[PDB]
Design a protein around this ligand. Sequence first.
Ligand SMILES: [Zn+2]
Ligand SMILES: [Zn+2]
Ligand SMILES: [Zn+2]
Lengths: 263, 47, 137, 66, 49, 113, 45
Amino acid sequence: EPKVNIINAQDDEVELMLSDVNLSLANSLRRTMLAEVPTLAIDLVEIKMNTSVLADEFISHRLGLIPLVSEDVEEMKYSRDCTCEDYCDECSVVLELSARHEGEEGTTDVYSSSLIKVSGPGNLNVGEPVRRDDYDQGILLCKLRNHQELNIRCIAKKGIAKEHAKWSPCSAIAFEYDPHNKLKHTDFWFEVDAKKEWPDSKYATWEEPPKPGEVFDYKAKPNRFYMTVETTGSLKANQVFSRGIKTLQEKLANVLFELENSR
Amino acid sequence: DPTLNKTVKIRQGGYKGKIGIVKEANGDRFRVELHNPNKTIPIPCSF
Amino acid sequence: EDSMIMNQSSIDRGLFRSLFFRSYMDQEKRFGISIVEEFEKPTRATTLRLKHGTYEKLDEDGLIAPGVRVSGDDIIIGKTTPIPPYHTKRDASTPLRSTENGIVDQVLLTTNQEGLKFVKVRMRTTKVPQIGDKFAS
Amino acid sequence: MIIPVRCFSCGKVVGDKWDAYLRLLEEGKQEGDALDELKLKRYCCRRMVLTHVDLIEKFLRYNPLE
Amino acid sequence: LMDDDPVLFNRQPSLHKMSMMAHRVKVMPYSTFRLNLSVTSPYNADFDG
Amino acid sequence: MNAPDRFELFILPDDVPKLKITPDSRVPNCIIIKFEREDHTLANLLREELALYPDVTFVAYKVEHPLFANFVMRLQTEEGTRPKQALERACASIINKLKTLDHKFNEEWNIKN
Amino acid sequence: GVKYTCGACAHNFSLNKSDPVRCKECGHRVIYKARTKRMIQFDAR
RNA sequence: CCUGGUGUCUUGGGUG
Ligand SMILES: [Zn+2]
Ligand SMILES: [Zn+2]
Ligand SMILES: [Zn+2]
């Protein structure tokens, strides 16, 4: 019975209409995509040399925020659940960076494209810092002048956004419903005339205005939820919507398991 | 005890892979002053 | 009553985060013709009334090195003063403030106007906004 | 100090758009239009680029201490 | 110190007797003291520092 | 210094059950379910679903304090049905609706590919 | 013994505390300790 | 093999 109608689509954002579901399910889907869809992100930085003007943990802090390709992350384990001694190939990706400026003039800009994957759970496509094109240098990390060097080793780990926002696959999630306020869930503030002073939703033409005579349907419920899921490139937009649903299933499944085992 | 004040790496648990220093080693439960957040934790010797 | 809710994810991405720096200064004092204090890592056998904290982060020159994390009551500058009339000296070392932690960032070594040795140790840490911190428009 | 990696409020990556923004200003575009071309539509993302102050160019002038 | 131990709570300046009342402890994370909001008035307390 | 570990929101201690059912013997056929290491995310989803069933006479939840990731739900059903069984039914319904919903998105997605 | 750094000319050298506090190269009287041998880790949070 | 001491007097700037 739930129906979906995709209004627009591209690699990093999907705009869609969701219908024939309960408000609570639309909201729980919104929350799950923001908070519980796993991704991969740097979580340990070993600084062997940093003679730049930026403080050590300042640079380390920027590193944690770099979005990494997380496509095959479902087959990867959490570090806290792995049976091994220290890290290994099954629970972490190791990245390395080394930059230096030779010459007495000019500035060497250190970009996220200099992050080199060194090991990783082959041959899974995980751990490369996301790029828009091939000639795109990416995210600015630091800047170097003559004789200043930066040589760091980064450990990337699987995590969820509940622990730290760097693991979130979404950015914003636009979300709205009932553009003409037929349900009367809001009571509009106005100075003179409520209709002229409030702007129209960008989905005003997707539903029909209330007729001037029409009585209030006290049985009507919210039923069409338009949302747009933008991502950072760490996951493709279609994967986020799919894995949001998948993750929410196992959580309910885990609850169902516990009831039939507690007797 | 011969392991106080020597540098340590943690190989199991939620703090697996982190550097620390043995601050106090009374018995079985160690006190590692973790480097990474400003906190000193109680931890078992198997780890 | 004039408190405020802050978005935890904004804090995670760096909102209102700040660096904090503290510098400690010390120098050798003169008490006589050849009676001067001395920077060193004090041995427990030869120096009385030692502090309760750890001395294991000092190098052989009596000074801690940049990059080492320190916690409260750790000694970062070892200095002794001799006892007038072996086992002749008394500790005059400087511990980190009990309520603080962070990383040693830089250590200045020089001499003062009177020619004795003179050190400064700057410590840096990062303060992350949390419940109780104060803000204003 | 240097351009933030993420927008504080919504999380969209903005740390890869700083160089593109300075170049557009040389070509005479106005600030509002430059942000428009970069597709920074929500005003949370716009504040990040429009109001950042690049102090790292000043700190680099102090001749390295090694 | 443990749950439901009584403690004496106090804000200066102690202008009258309800500047010092006994509360029951509840141990909690984070470093501020928590008060139910309806006791701010007798202490003439607020949360601006 | 007193900030708790953020991973404590979802990682269950070994001596702590994920789920705890106790009776409310003050009224007939009423249980209190305490959910550990969970949020509004799970709770609101179950709550609305349950309320549309004809044999559920009372359902409610509260997150008692946001600094602790738990919530407690109260569920009373009429004499015929056993509350704990009814909860299982609500769970399976939603798993089915999301399975269907995932399928219909996949189909619509390839057409736009 | 202990690595130092000249505040003017950046030459590196060691001193076994009893030596006078100056740079061998330029005579500068402000010097700095070099960083520890130990590895430093940060959680990138 | 238990005990285990680090200053004062001011002044100035601040918080409610
Ligand atoms: Zn592993
Ligand atoms: Zn924004
Ligand atoms: Zn020199």
